[PDB]
Ligand binder design. Structure first.
Ligand SMILES: Nc1ccn([C@@H]2O[C@H](CO)[C@@H](O)[C@H](O)[C@H]2O)c(=O)n1
Ligand SMILES: Nc1ccn([C@@H]2O[C@H](CO)[C@@H](O)[C@H](O)[C@H]2O)c(=O)n1
Ligand SMILES: *Cc1c(COP(=O)(O)O)cnc(C)c1O
Ligand SMILES: *Cc1c(COP(=O)(O)O)cnc(C)c1O
Lengths: 810, 810
């Protein structure tokens, strides 16, 4: 059908069809008379999977022959989403498969909607890992993703009575055709026990053993025949476990619960034992696998030359003391040499500066669960502080500030401090975030070892986030500059020479209109909700959190509503305000924010005077597959976190690449995006980081804004009086109280400028031609935000390996 | 290689090889350089499985088109064993596969040893179900096996320090290539709740829901292209289950524990709630499936004409009140009509008369778990007793004896009484057992409804128990009378005309010698134990239980030992005494019996004076795959249960078909076996049922035998004094005490005659020619014991369907 989707050759279509029927028969054991759409989806998935195996096997054989340096990306989250379409895109089988299923009398798009999302992540951090695996394979790096195969991923969100309800994400129910169990490579992981000091070295004994069973999933690069591996561990009890009889067998669940479910917290630390077990489980099994592969290439001096371990945040920070444990206790290396190897092998990536998100584990927990690791951590701390004391003689407070051990009610281990000490590189995820790390929370560490600190601005893969979700846009772009940009996004700059091209302007605007129509139809299909395709699509999708300020968006919405009710017969640009995202189960304020959003919709969407001029919809169960649908349909991207809180953000990049203009604060990557496109082509507003600091030094008093802004006051009074909750007048008392007395994120401080900026957005939307020209300038300068650029920088500046675009023989 | 194993055509071998490589590559994702024997086993299994699918699909389509009466065999146990070789035998692919793997450079026998046993059973009852499925498919019946897919089957037995140790049977660890999950057919099962009585009928509400997910396994008939289905249910929690957040997800295990593990009891009832849940779980899911299939053929009058439900013991007895519940509460039929349908649909098979094995569930358990079913049971009881009262006016004791409700400390429901009342047929499993049912425990029921009582003597499938495990014997037999006997075992009688044939006598004896050599080699291979292949193989394999009297065997062994020590330089026929079997985890006496056996071996096997004249080995982890190895190698089959206790026995039939002579009591099927072969060709001894009764009436006093039998006294003194347990002189005090004061099975009463009979066995073994001629007379008359004969009788006399030998188009 379309160019970028590959060729539909006669031979290939014929071969796909026969293999499709073969799997339906032999694999699914069904016939065309009893087969259901799900059956057809699986027949197609297995057919596509077959094309991966040959490449998968030779890629791994290749790495064996050449023995390049291996990159191990450790993460407790991999937000993969669906795999079928992505695989077809990277293998250039999309048009062929579409034609083949068409000839078999089936609609491939219908079949793609049957695949469950692999929701093994919470949000940005997990999605970044997913985009990174794609870029590493596309850049020909010998990389391996290592994580946990959760039986239940992020919960499915249902909205009942306007409230979020959670339900188990049983994503493996019908089976996962993409994974391959490798029980032959099962490894043991130890817990509890005690430390015994003998003649030669310490020994960790009397431990409880839990088996780690690996499952491998292929990660295809973009049309280069490279297929890397993502290995996820599953917990299994040994057969002699707890071995009345019946109970012992039933108690096997205790050990296997380790890989049962993903903790649903976004930017928030919960110090539960089960979570600590998951963190060690992934680290212990992974390191054994790494060392095994290394030995099958004694001389650990070359370990750093053949291995690179990237820690996605502090979640897998135990890799540092675990590596030391193995080298010292098992391999018998002296401490100093072991430490040298560890530091040169590990690298740490920080993703946030929010205090409540940093991991600080209670010493009593580590003491009971991992006694040997606690001893190693103390030793690491002791030697680290000796170095600090020698560099800053007499600075006793610096010593207490930099310690890995925090004193107080309960002693805790600061995992971030542990990561900085044991890594040769520490990076932030956006220029401003990395600068904040050096000026604030890690200032002491930066002064001790300035060379360790770097920046690696985040990115997104243009395969899934452009070609896959927006083929219409990828096509009109390819028509003008070719297909090369898909693996070299910087080429989009060439589109700048078409900003005055009347044909292109029309095509860009047409693609957007088509996406909006398709999404508007979807909302009625699966959610039965009417919306005006002609209105401006104002969307904010991301996890619900106070720092992301969905509340500021709500205030604007209510303002628009009050203004209409004030001057009913006055013209206003029609808007469809869409807000979506999940709230962590135990985050009360976040759940109240979702309720407020639906409550506003209940009032606004049923007011006759408003008509189709303003709609407020809450997008239920926001996840990767839904993002691929709503982002291509958006006109306005809301990125309004309080300056200094959103480390980078990645959703912002997805919107920019797909034709949406951005309204946001100078926070995270927004700064670099505005810098690339030009501030005149971005809708910036609000306090800058320096302004927030000034306000804090002076003291933030929300009452002041309430007293001086009539429109704001009216909104707060509506909330308090029950205007949005008739039957429950004080339903939103907590929200008002927080906004008025303890708003850590200064919602009111940016209200005026936000509303003003939004007016400028509406003014531009009234001029179709100029709105589209600004969109073109955004798309044309989004090249820097490709994860291929990010990974190439990690490769050269941290891992010490050269990326490759060379194809492998198919 | 051998005739009975089929042809190895050029086309077939070529096709098998290419498909083998295809699966190794595409299915296992491996190459010949990294593939392990397990990998090769799976490549072969998938290759063989492919040949099943076509036949499997058309067989089921066939039943849809013709709509014959369906047979549903409900059992909580299906002792299947391995599936690879059995599938090849029934599809006539054995020689072709052997040749193909040979050309690929692999030993197929080595690969077959890698497959885990499907140990979803405890012993005879479970194995019978397995043999029955094979015969039903071979006889072209539209039959379905329905059970539970236990995650853990019968435990693996390890022997440590002479004691049994149990370990989880994680048989699904590497995956099961034979099963096909059918999540699309998942059904809900209800538990707890309460009964609500409304205007029209009762309603079962406020129940907890557990999902039943089916897994289908193909059951191929013998070379007739018929492939039936065995559907096993797996427990799954609904996604809204218990829906802090984390705990709710983890608690899903509570519901899924229902299908976690098989209760390891043989001939013993344990009234645990979890077991009751398993029984209802299989019954509820199965009945919904049956009715669904029936409706997809309102007129429930024809239900009995299209459906037959066979209850394997009382384990699935809840099917009776569950069927009533559905017809009355859901379909709205009047009681009388519903009862008529139920009775004509259900049939019950009793497998034992031991009081401790009968199911008697506490009313308080049913009351809490299945409130509606308890009400229905009371109603059934009320109407049943009204019928008894009308037939035997004034006989109040009969009323209390026949009630389904037993009074006492705690009220219980007698499931056996429930089954007789709600079934149109009740059968025993051997002539003598069925007669005992009518004369004793079910005497009252027989007098009320004589027509319901039948006999269906058990049998074993000659495919697995002859062709598969003893190809050498199947071959020499086929050489003389053809291959027809494999599906018509009665033809073995033609072998009677070869009893004087010198060539045949030599071949029969040669096959046995080869089997013994092969097994002797196996014992050293996997268990490192030396044995003399020239000695007589005296084996007793079956679950450990006091009624099976492994203790009587031990007494004989010790007698042989003492006699040798008494007259060292006297000649005696060399013997290798092999005893094997698992003991239920909570059965103390059974565990002490295993310890005694090993202790005897410790003494006997290391006594220089004995030499290679006597060896005592305990066969560890006895299971189906081990039975297929030891039975073909046995010379003497020990079937020595106390007369009246072994309902039928089936191991006895396996030994008879494979060339072993039998020493046993006139119990169970032994009676019919001796009758078929002729008592002169059987080694019968001991009390007959009538003798046991006489002894009980008089009072069994073990002391009497101890006082009058010097040799017996010596043995008891050796046991008591610690002769077999030096470091622990009183280790076997419990055994001695039981034997002397409370032996329910009169071990001493049969001692003298047993020892005497054993001497007659040794005398015959000294004459090779005559021993073999007697063996030939046994093999030649074992035809009656084929499960094809048993099933044909069930079909005609109970289910009302005609068996068919006609092939289906392949
Ligand atoms: N636990 C955490 C910490 C940070 N983050 C997020 O990670 C992404 C990727 O770097 C950032 O772009 C985002 O700004 C940050 O909040 C997250 O999703 N979860
Ligand atoms: N729970 C029980 C009850 C009887 N049985 C057994 O069933 C078989 C098959 O009919 C009989 O041959 C055997 O005699 C009996 O003990 C058993 O294995 N388990
Ligand atoms: C891209 C993405 C995110 C991250 O969005 P931000 O706005 O950067 O927080 C979160 N969830 C999903 C499903 C995503 O695709
Ligand atoms: C045949 C068989 C049985 C039944 O044996 P009996 O001696 O009749 O009790 C038990 N276990 C296995 C593994 C069998 O194959």
């Amino acid at each position: 059908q379309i160019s970028v989707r590959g060729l539909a050759g006669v031979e290939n279509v014929t071969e796909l069809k026969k293999n499709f029927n073969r799997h339906l028969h032999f694999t699914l054991v069904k016939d065309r008379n009893v087969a259901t759409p799900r059956d057809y989806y699986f027949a197609l998935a297995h057919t596509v999977r077959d094309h991966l195996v040959g490449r998968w096997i030779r890629t791994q054989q290749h790495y064996y022959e050449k023995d390049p340096k291996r990159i191990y990306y450790l993460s407790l989250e991999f937000y993969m989403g669906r795999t079928l379409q992505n695989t077809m895109v990277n293998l250039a089988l999309e048009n062929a498969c579409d034609e083949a299923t068409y000839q078999l009398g089936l609609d491939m798009e219908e079949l793609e909607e049957i695949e469950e999302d692999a929701g093994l992540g919470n949000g940005g951090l997990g999605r970044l890992a997913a985009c990174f695996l794609d870029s590493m394979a596309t850049l020909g790096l010998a990389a391996y993703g290592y994580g946990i195969r959760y039986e239940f991923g992020i919960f499915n969100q249902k909205i009942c009575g306007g409230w979020q309800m959670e339900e188990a994400d049983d994503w493996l129910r019908y089976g996962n055709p993409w994974e391959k169990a490798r029980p032959e490579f099962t490894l043991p992981v130890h817990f509890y026990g005690r430390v015994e000091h003998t003649s030669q070295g310490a020994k960790w004994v009397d431990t409880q053993v839990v088996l780690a069973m690996p499952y491998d999933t292929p990660v295809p690069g973009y049309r280069n025949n490279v297929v890397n591996t993502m290995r996820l561990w599953s917990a299994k009890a040994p057969n002699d476990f707890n071995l009345g009889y019946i109970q012992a067998v039933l108690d096997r669940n205790l050990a296997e619960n380790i890989s049962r479910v993903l903790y649903p917290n976004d930017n928030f630390f919960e110090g539960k034992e089960l979570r600590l077990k998951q963190e060690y489980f992934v680290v212990a099994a992974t390191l054994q696998d790494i060392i095994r592969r290394f030995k099958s290439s004694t001389n650990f001096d070359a370990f750093p030359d053949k291995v690179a371990i990237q820690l996605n945040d502090t979640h897998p920070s135990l890799a540092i003391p675990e590596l030391m444990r193995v080298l010292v206790d098992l391999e018998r290396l002296d401490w100093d040499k072991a430490w040298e190897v560890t530091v040169k092998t590990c690298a740490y990536t920080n993703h946030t500066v929010l205090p409540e998100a940093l991991e600080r584990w209670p010493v009593h927990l580590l003491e009971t669960l991992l006694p040997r690791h606690l001893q190693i951590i103390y030793e690491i701390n002791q030697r680290f502080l000796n170095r600090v004391a020698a560099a800053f003689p007499g600075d006793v407070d610096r010593l207490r500030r930099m310690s890995l051990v925090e004193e107080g009610a309960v002693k805790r281990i600061n995992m971030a401090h542990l990561c900085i000490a044991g890594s040769h590189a520490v990076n932030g995820v956006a220029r401003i975030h990395s600068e904040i790390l050096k000026k604030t929370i890690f200032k002491d560490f930066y002064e001790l070892e300035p060379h360790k600190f770097q920046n690696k601005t985040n990115g997104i893969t243009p395969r899934r986030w452009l070609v896959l979700c927006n083929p219409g846009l990828a096509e009109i772009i390819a028509e003008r500059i070719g297909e090369e940009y898909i693996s070299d996004l910087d080429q989009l700059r060439k589109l700048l020479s078409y900003v005055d091209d009347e044909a292109f302007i029309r095509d860009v605007a047409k693609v957007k209109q088509e996406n909006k129509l398709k999404f508007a139809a979807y909302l009625e299909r699966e959610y039965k909700v009417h919306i005006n395709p002609n209105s401006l699509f104002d969307v904010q999708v991301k996890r619900i959190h106070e720092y992301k300020r969905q509340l500021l968006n709500c205030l604007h919405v209510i303002t628009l509503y009050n203004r209409i009710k004030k001057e009913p017969n006055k013209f206003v640009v029609p808007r469809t305000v869409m807000i979506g995202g999940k709230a962590a189960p135990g985050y009360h304020m976040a759940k109240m924010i979702i309720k407020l959003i639906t409550a506003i919709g209940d009032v606004v969407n049923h007011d006759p005077v408003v008509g189709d001029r303003l709609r407020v919809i809450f997008l239920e169960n926001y996840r990767v597959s839904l993002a691929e649908k709503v982002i291509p349909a958006a006109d306005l991207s809301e990125q309004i976190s309080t300056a200094g809180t959103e480390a980078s953000g990645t959703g912002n990049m997805k919107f920019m690449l797909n034709g949406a203009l951005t309204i946001g604060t100078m926070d995270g990557a927004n700064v670099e995006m505005a810098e690339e496109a030009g501030e005149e082509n971005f809708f910036i507003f609000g306090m800058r980081v320096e302004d927030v600091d000034r306000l804090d030094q002076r003291g933030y008093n929300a009452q002041e804004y309430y007293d001086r802004i009539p429109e704001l006051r009216q909104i707060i009074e509506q909330l308090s009086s029950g205007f949005f909750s008739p039957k429950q007048p004080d339903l939103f008392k907590d929200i008002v109280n927080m906004l008025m007395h303890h708003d850590r994120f200064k919602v009111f401080a940016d209200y005026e400028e936000y509303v003003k900026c939004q007016e400028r957005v509406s003014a531009l939307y009234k001029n179709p031609r100029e709105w589209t020209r600004m969109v073109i300038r955004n798309i044309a300068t989004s090249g820097k935000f490709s994860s291929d650029r990010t990974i190439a920088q990690y490769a050269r500046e941290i891992w010490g390996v050269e990326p490759s675009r060379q194809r492998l023989p198919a």
